[PDB]
Amino acid sequence: SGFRKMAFPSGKVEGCMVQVTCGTTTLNGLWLDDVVYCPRHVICTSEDMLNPNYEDLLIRKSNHNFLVQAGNVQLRVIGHSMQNCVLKLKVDTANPKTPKYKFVRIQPGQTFSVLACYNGSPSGVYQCAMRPNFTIKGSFLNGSCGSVGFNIDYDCVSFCYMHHMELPTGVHAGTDLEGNFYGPFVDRQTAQAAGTDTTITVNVLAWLYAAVINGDRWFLNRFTTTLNDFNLVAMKYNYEPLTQDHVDILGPLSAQTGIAVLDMCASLKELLQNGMNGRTILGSALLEDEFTPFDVVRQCS
Amino acid sequence: SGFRKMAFPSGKVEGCMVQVTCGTTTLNGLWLDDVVYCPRHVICTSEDMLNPNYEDLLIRKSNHNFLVQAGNVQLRVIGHSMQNCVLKLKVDTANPKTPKYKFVRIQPGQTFSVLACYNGSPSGVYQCAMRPNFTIKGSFLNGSCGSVGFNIDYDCVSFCYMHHMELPTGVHAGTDLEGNFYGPFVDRQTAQAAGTDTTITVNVLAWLYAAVINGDRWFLNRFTTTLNDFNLVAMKYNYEPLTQDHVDILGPLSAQTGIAVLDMCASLKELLQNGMNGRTILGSALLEDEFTPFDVVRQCSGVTFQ
Ligand SMILES: O=C1C[C@@H](C(=O)NCC(=O)N(c2ccccc2)c2ccccc2)c2ccccc21
Ligand SMILES: O=C1C[C@@H](C(=O)NCC(=O)N(c2ccccc2)c2ccccc2)c2ccccc21
């Protein structure tokens, strides 16, 4: 019983964090096997960012210009290359603490744990969702660049986010570990902005189920709805559409509580229109959308 | 920018978790040097818990009646002893992943991270507070007993909590690592229940300071209050009394933001009496009390661990 914002244990990722220095800049990197991954903007000065030619900037760098340190030890850099917006530093030692891992690109709505680091050392761990507008709402300061986001499933780390920049609105932008940005962002100095955001409907439904597992019931009503009618209401209130896959993914929580998916949608429908009436669900006065149906199953069953 | 409920990195603690099995019961243990610490209720059958005589139960166990496993390697038990509500199993090898560590007893209102574990395998980590009523509002299922709570101080893990039971309201009770319970709970089947709880005032104020640091300023107003006047309103909404010590420890956040402590109390007074009128603070439509003053400073100043 209980329901908390729970992160993955971070130890397998802590064993991969390093510090990467190129000239006057230091940021974080991720050491897997004999490669260190970090944002390619490490190689840029402030003046370079106005109009960078990353391929030329990198031609003017050599292996010796990159200082890589794992705790107190310098790694020898023996090669360098760029894949999209990620720099890959080859080093002469494979990380002995390399976990089982994969790189995955996640969809909006999906959650992960962030290990916020500075200078290759950890500050803390917390859960984030990829927003529909491809930002995350993290907690990050200068020098957090190169911190990563991940999930852990049957002993295997799936890295899905590398942190690159904070946007003027105070939210965060980055890439997958193949170096492709999430959303319309770029690693140079230009006006760029996140669009309008929406609420992750399937996550809100998963959280309602969680509330029912923990004994909340007051929002269940006597009504039902169709998927198409629910989606008409959702759009008015800037909620993402709910798809049949979503319904299917919510099956297990449906099974466990007795509450048909469309009946829970009928509950949300009334909440979207009429609000929470001064009431709380699982410790909150707003509808929470950063728990997936898998986050809920993991903690509640 | 941003302000999250941030847990400690858990790697130093993950390397200490093991499984302990006695009869049909399996729960988690903490392996530090050549000792394994776990709840002593591991030695009890369901029959025994009505009125356990732990020293009579324990004297009847042999070393070989305990099965301790690190992963799927057996740690042979070579000695046992009880200290308060914790069992200490001496084992035949020292954990080579033992971090620097200390046992510390925390006070109510203080915060720590829980590493929730099942069958000796960590499943996740979250940050929570010790409630005024000495419970924790954790997230735990059957099997979680022996899971621990901790803080990190530079390179040192300060262990503060070991999980023993869920009470009937769905909150959590346990001990320090010397096996003394927080609060008036006991490790037997009783009708014990969670006493009346309050909101941790100082922590709410700390989080309003976090909000200001992050640019969320709408609840700042032109009024002030005295400490005594404030406490009258605190009493009515079931908030802990604010003391001059609490006022002192908000000193640094006050200095950083330029908002006097008693002006921030004036802002909270108004939020209590009026509510939020539809608005949010740091993404919440409720007043949050699980960040301490030091927690705000640590996150906002990018403190790391070694
Ligand atoms: O969460 C973060 C990470 C950090 C950040 O935003 N880094 C970005 C950054 O430093 N640059 C850059 C700038 C000048 C030379 C080279 C790179 C940048 C610029 C444009 C596009 C992409 C990268 C930060 C700073 C202050 C507060 C919060 C935070
Ligand atoms: O958060 C937890 C941990 C788990 C718990 O509360 N276990 C308690 C428990 O197993 N016993 C006991 C019982 C029979 C023999 C021996 C011990 C118990 C009884 C009284 C006093 C203290 C210990 C649990 C069960 C359900 C949901 C959530 C949770």
Swiss-Prot record, chain A:
It is found in: Host cytoplasm; Host Golgi apparatus; Host nucleus. Coiled coil: none annotated. The active site is at 41 (for 3cl-pro activity), 145 (nucleophile). Residues 1-301 are cytoplasmic. Inhibited by pyridone-containing alpha-ketoamides compounds 13a and 13b. In turn, alpha-ketoamide 13b (tert-butyl (1-((S)-1-(((S)-4-(benzylamino)-3,4-dioxo-1-((S)-2-oxopyrrolidin-3-yl)butan-2-yl)amino)-3-cyclopropyl-1-oxopropan-2-yl)-2-oxo-1,2-dihydropyridin-3-yl)carbamate) inhibits SARS-CoV-2 replication in human lung cells. Inhibited ex vivo by michael acceptor inhibitor N3. Inhibited ex vivo by compound 11a and 11b. It comes from the Viruses. There is a cross-link at residues 5, 90 (Glycyl lysine isopeptide (Lys-Gly) (interchain with G-Cter in ubiquitin)). Residues 1-301 form the Peptidase C30 domain. It catalyses: TSAVLQ-|-SGFRK-NH2 and SGVTFQ-|-GKFKK the two peptides corresponding to the two self-cleavage sites of the SARS 3C-like proteinase are the two most reactive peptide substrates. The enzyme exhibits a strong preference for substrates containing Gln at P1 position and Leu at P2 position. Cleaves the C-terminus of replicase polyprotein at 11 sites. Recognizes substrates containing the core sequence [ILMVF]-Q-|-[SGACN]. Cleaves and inactivates human TRMT1, preventing tRNA guanine(26)-dimethylation of tRNAs. May cleave human NLRP1 in lung epithelial cells, thereby activating the NLRP1 inflammasome pathway. May cleave human GSDMD, triggering alternative GSDME-mediated epithelial cell death upon activation of the NLRP1 inflammasome, which may enhance the release interleukins 1B, 6, 16 and 18. Also able to bind an ADP-ribose-1''-phosphate (ADRP). 3CL-PRO exists as monomer and homodimer. Only the homodimer shows catalytic activity. Interacts with host FBXO22; this interaction promotes the proteasomal degradation of nsp5. This is 3C-like proteinase nsp5. It comes from Severe acute respiratory syndrome coronavirus 2 (2019-nCoV).
